[PDB]
């Protein structure tokens, strides 16, 4: 039961949480795992946070992604308040009230990446490629590792995800087509879809491919 993770907190705020986790006997730690039940995000007064890896994974796993205000206010009323009353409402990129967290929780029966095959191809900054994979997994996708490896039939949609600025300042990936028939999209297609917890159209994320 109850296992916390923190994101965007200074060491200082981390202690108020430790003091809070101590009292209520919650397993508080630095690394986000499969046993984690809550992701506590630093937010503004309106429960909007910035997008960190933990934010994406908290959503993907259908965990409680709650404002750090849940801790401070509980600490204030000496009693552990309801997570729902402090759930993150959105972020600085995809919308302030998109309700992605709550949608992830209420959509565990219908994962957005359901029936999709995705290969995180290429280099990736600030987010280990293995994390980006676990993220598409938790969201229901099937992970591939090898461009020429995708499943060849019609009950499955293959997707190639890349971070264009994670290589150089000369081109070379408008050529991933020559290695498959799968559409290639920037990593933003995953981040946006996951944050809003709604599979997005590939259109604005498509990367022009040579023949």
């Amino acid at each position: 039961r109850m296992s916390m993770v923190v994101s965007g907190l200074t060491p200082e705020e981390f202690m108020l949480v430790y003091k809070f986790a101590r009292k209520h006997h919650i397993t508080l730690t630095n690394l986000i795992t499969e046993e984690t039940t809550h992701v506590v995000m630093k937010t503004d007064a309106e429960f909007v946070c910035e997008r960190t890896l933990k934010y994406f994974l908290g959503i993907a796993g259908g965990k409680w992604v709650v404002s750090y205000f849940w801790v401070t206010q509980s600490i204030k009323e000496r009693k552990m308040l309801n997570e729902h009353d402090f759930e993150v409402r959105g972020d600085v990129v995809n919308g302030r009230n998109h309700q992605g967290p709550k949608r992830a929780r209420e959509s565990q029966d219908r994962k957005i990446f359901r029936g999709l095959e995705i290969c995180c191809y290429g280099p990736f900054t600030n987010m280990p490629t293995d994390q980006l994979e676990w993220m598409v997994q938790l969201c229901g996708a099937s992970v591939v590792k090898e461009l020429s490896s995708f499943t060849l039939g019609t009950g499955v949609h293959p997707i190639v995800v890349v971070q264009p600025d994670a290589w150089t300042e000369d081109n070379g990936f408008h050529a991933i087509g020559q290695m498959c028939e799968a559409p290639v999209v920037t990593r933003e297609w995953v981040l946006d879809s996951v944050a809003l917890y709604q599979c997005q159209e590939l259109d604005t994320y498509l990367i022009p491919q040579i023949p």
């Binding site: 630093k42 910035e50 997008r51 600085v92």
Partner: peptide
């Protein structure tokens, strides 16, 4: 908002 060493993804 975020005040940790944790990277943020607000663009690419």
């Amino acid at each position: 908002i975020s005040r940790s060493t944790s990277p943020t993804f607000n663009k690419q």
